[PDB]
């Protein structure tokens with residue numbers, strides 16, 4: 319474990335309404351820099367969920383999943399990835415990030431999700447805000463606060479919300495599955511190829527398609543109707559048609575028709591290889 323007496327707060331990395339992450343120096347004896355996740359508005363339910371999240375991350379060992387380091391007395395300690403979220407990184411470096419590089423990040427996210435599927439985990443929160451950048455060549459899935467373990471007897475989990483990333487059956491039945499993670503991956507791919515431009519973000523695009531007359535519950539209603547009538551996010555400027563087609567396959571209303579992460583990884587890798595080779 320970690321001795322809090324040797325943890326010095328250096329910078330806030332994220333301050334949510336139910337959790338926060340701090341950059342702290344752990345110097346037990348010049349020491350190391352670590353990322354420290356703590357609970358905000360800690361209720362008995364929230365601490366129970368945080369305990370399970372801790373256990374889920376400790377069980378994960380993958381190049382594209384943020385590294386668990388341990389716990390402190392209750393705080394979650396990991397590594398400090400110094401380039402922050404992919405949102406900040408892509409915004410800052412967009413002029414230098416070509417499509418071959420976007421597909422490198424896409425492939426890495428895909429392989430992390432592939433690995434999560436092996437353990438029958440549903441992430442439920444796949445979005446660029448939850449992808450961290452270690453260096454210019456490696457990103458990692460960085461947060462698992464909504465992740466669920468599928469029950470032994472079902473291939474979905476029902477849960478009582480980032481609605482603009484949600485599959486239709488998550489919006490209607492509160493059902494989450496690998497296939498609804500694939501839907502959200504399609505939205506991540508859209509985020510990447512819009513270079514995280516806020517006026518092109520999923521919430522901005524969907525509200526323009528719906529109408530900004532709506533508020534709260536009615537937004538969800540017209541989003542469901544929109545998706546049921548096959549309204550979809552548009553092809554981002556400059557986005558290759560083959561990549562948009564993958565997005566649209568992830569966004570199939572028919573759950574059975576969405577691709578697997580294994581197949582997504584294979585195709586993304588092939589497209590990137592063809593792009594780099596000039597074929």
Ligand SMILES: CCS(=O)(=O)N1CC(CC#N)(n2cc(-c3ncnc4[nH]ccc34)cn2)C1
Pocket residue numbers: 331332333334335336337338339353355384396397398399400402403447448449450459460461463
């Ligand atoms: C849900 C509220 S939050 O503030 O806890 N949340 C985690 C969050 C999203 C992700 N991943 N975040 C993580 C970091 C981060 N940066 C640098 N190294 C790191 N290691 C582990 C996390 C991490 C910064 N913001 C934002």
